[PDB]
Write a protein that binds this DNA or RNA. Structure first.
Length: 747
DNA sequence: GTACGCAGTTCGC
């Protein structure tokens, strides 16, 4: 099983290193024959002699094209003839590619921004994490005395805890008598002992939580000032710190540094992403937070250091357990994308689709288009189109509801109608499909690049779902469930890709055609069920709707829907099909995107209401949840009223716990690009002045204190809140938080 | 930083 791959340099030549694990043994395979390359579209083949003689001078060494090779590829389905230009080293590619482009005989270059390691895995057909190997994992965390804005690595690390499946220990240079605490003499010996532990355990995966931007980086900085060789790699090497724009990333050669933080942000929606919120989300019980204000007073006084030693041990153990749950899912994603677990776990959906498309492009001799230049990127950002159909719901309570949704509407449309930039308005075909309203035509004579890819994807999902039915191993069934679910997410994101401004295969006309077809298909089904089958559709959004027959009994509502399923699915073309979501006793549709609906087993499903939003305080969510749980399940408005009158009196009496009053809002940009101040924006400026890290994506936790005027003039971060000196704005959380949320349901 | 559709709160003016 392939874990990772990079390249070293030997006698000036690159040698790919394939880090493997076979039969429980670490191995490293070496490939010395692979070379970097770009593609060049030449005006005349005769100009290749002048193009070879294009030279650059990097590192004081004259760099040149080492091999020119003319190849025939397809560019948006059309055969193209380009020159494959090879270089000696991947590092001199960025220095010479601009001069190759600048040649007047070169129309353009292609595939010039693909890293050497990822180029190798693609061109060789190598899929990481494929195989039957159990990976050994070790989690670790550190406890420091670092201050916000206090450089980085200047404060000493106090504690280093680690945890695997066999133990969880704390290493420290402070006298603590706990049986899991190993007291060393110096901070240096604490770090060195940690290095031996990792070396002795030799784990395939090092698990951290936010280790890319703190724990690992701080460890490297402390080892720098203290003069310690931070040897962690299986090749005797130090972890490497790279930059990802607003973010840093730490890589440990020979192992996989699995930072859980970028994975949780992209997999789970949470109000905040502290290790304790995460723990309380995936696992049942909570965690006993230990704040940096206590860790300083615990060193100073020396007392209570047992507590922080326990919290350091709990962080490591919780990090390991969360890692053991999320690593299998991310392993399946790396297999699907075909890139390393290290890179897959830290990249966005758009980047995962790019790597997948680039691989599939290689398999089909499809030359990849370049990412847009500045003007084109901006043009794509300034461009939009119409999307899904959202029916204004029949607002109120309704009884006896059936839900019918399309199966992968986007991918079904793209495959059925061959929606692809290589088929759009393609000339000379015998068969065409025309997108409604927008009128774009798509050639059906030959499979387009993307539609053919989606067909293989939806195929593969059926093959995985089939095995998942007829397999015994509950772990294997789960791993397969990960795969088929990942295939569905990957496929369904392909519609929006066509409108992604950074996409190589960007096609606004294609994206326009998917939504236009989807709008036609849903409105046609909604009309058919209301015409021929006497149904009344209540709520409808994009690919699905909620319908019923007024007055009809619960059973005949079901049996008449199944009747409509076989009717509409016959006339439906291609892979377009309607499925049966489920029957639900009652359902209140407050407004567009805002509804809730109760199944037969008395478990409410909630969508769009303030209950699920993170920018609403828990006191408002809980009350709305309890209020909605009344009218939906117990139908009691009088109780619902007693709940509102209840929670208002606790707030006015200042008895509701302040933690139920924090609002979680995200910073989405540089604080200076904001053209309108808000509560969370003003709190962010205070933290920015305090030295606190303030970047796009930082969740702001703040409370509104009592007073009058701008909410932002009365808002402070929660870590600055103190009931002994602060008084919270109860009136605000009554009039602007609790009362508006409960009003929507009662109205 | 896959897309657009959409509700609802804060704030300037």
């Amino acid at each position: 099983m392939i874990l990772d791959a990079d390249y070293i340099t030997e006698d000036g030549k690159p040698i790919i290193r394939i880090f493997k694990k076979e039969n429980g043994e670490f191995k490293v395979e070496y490939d010395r024959n692979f070379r970097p390359y770009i593609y060049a579209l030449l005006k005349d083949d005769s100009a290749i002699e002048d193009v070879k003689k294009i030279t650059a001078e990097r590192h004081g060494t004259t760099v040149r094209v080492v091999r020119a090779e003319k190849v025939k590829k397809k560019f948006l389905g059309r055969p193209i003839e380009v020159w494959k230009l090879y270089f000696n080293h991947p590092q001199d590619q960025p220095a010479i590619r601009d001069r190759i482009r600048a040649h007047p005989a070169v129309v353009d270059i292609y595939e010039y921004d693909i890293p050497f390691a990822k180029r190798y895995l693609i061109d060789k057909g190598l899929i990481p994490m494929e195989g039957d190997e159990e990976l050994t994992m070790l989690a670790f965390a550190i406890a420091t005395l670092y201050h916000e804005g206090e450089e980085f690595g200047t404060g000493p690390i106090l504690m280093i805890s680690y945890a695997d499946g066999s133990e969880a220990r704390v290493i420290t240079w402070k006298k603590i008598d706990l049986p899991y605490v190993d007291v060393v003499s110096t901070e240096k010996e604490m770090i060195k002992r940690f290095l031996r532990v990792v070396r002795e355990k030799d784990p395939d995966v090092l698990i951290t939580y936010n280790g890319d931007n703190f724990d690992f980086a701080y460890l490297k900085k402390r080892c720098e000032e203290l003069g310690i060789k931070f040897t962690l790699g299986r090749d005797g090497s130090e972890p490497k710190i790279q930059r990802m724009g607003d973010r840093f990333a730490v890589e440990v050669k020979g192992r996989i540094h699995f930072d859980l933080y970028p994975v949780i942000r992209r997999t789970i929606n949470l109000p905040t992403y502290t290790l304790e919120a995460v723990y309380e989300a995936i696992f049942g019980q909570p965690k006993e937070k230990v704040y940096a204000e206590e860790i300083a007073q615990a060193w100073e006084t020396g007392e209570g250091l047992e507590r922080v030693a326990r919290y350091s041990m709990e962080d490591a153990k919780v990090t390991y357990e969360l890692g053991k749950e999320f690593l299998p899912m991310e392993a399946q994603l790396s297999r699907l994308i075909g890139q390393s677990l290290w890179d897959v776990s830290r990249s966005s959906t758009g980047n995962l689709v790019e790597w997948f498309l680039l691989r599939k492009a290689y398999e089909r001799n499809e030359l990849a288009p370049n990412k847009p230049d500045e003007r084109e990127y901006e043009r794509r950002l300034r461009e939009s189109y119409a999307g899904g159909y959202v029916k204004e719901p029949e607002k109120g309570l309704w009884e006896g509801l059936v839900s019918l949704d399309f199966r992968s509407l986007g991918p079904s449309i793209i495959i059925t109608h061959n929606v692809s930039p290589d088929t759009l308005n393609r000339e000379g075909c015998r068969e065409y499909d025309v997108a409604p309203e927008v009128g774009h035509k798509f050639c059906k004579d030959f499979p387009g690049f993307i539609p053919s890819l989606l067909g293989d994807l939806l195929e593969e999902r059926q093959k995985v779902k089939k095995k998942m039915k007829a397999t015994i191993d509950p772990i294997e069934k789960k791993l397969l469930d990960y795969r088929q679910r990942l295939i569905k997410i990957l496929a369904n994101s392909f519609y929006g890709y066509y409108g992604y401004a950074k996409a190589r295969w960007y096609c606004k006309e294609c994206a326009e055609s998917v939504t236009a077809w989807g709008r036609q298909y849903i409105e046609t089904t909604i009309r058919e069920i209301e015409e021929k089958f006497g149904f009344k559709v209540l709520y409808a959004d994009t690919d699905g709707f909620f319908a019923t027959i007024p007055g009809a009994d619960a059973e005949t509502v079901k049996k008449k829907a199944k009747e409509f399923l076989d009717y509409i699915n016959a006339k439906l073309p291609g892979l377009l099909e309607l499925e049966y979501e489920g029957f639900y006793k009652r359902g209140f549709f407050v407004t567009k995107k805002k509804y809730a609906v109760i199944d037969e087993e008395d478990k409410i499903t909630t969508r769009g209401l303030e209950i699920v939003r993170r920018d609403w305080s828990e006191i408002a969510k809980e009350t709305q949840a309890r209020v909605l749980e009344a009218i939906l399940k117990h139908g009691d408005v009088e109780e619902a009223v007693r709940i509102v009158k209840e929670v208002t009196e606790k707030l006015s009496k200042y008895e509701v716990p302040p933690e139920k009053l924090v609002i979680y809002k995200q910073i989405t940009r540089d604080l200076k690009d904001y053209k309108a101040t808000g509560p969370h924006v003003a709190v962010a400026k205070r933290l920015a002045a305090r030295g606190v890290k303030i970047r796009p994506g930082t969740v702001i936790s703040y409370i509104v204190l009592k007073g009058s005027g701008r909410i932002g003039d009365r808002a402070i971060p929660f870590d600055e809140f103190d009931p002994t000196k602060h008084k919270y704005d109860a009136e605000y959380y009554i009039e602007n938080q609790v009362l508006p949320a409960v009003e929507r349901i009662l109205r």
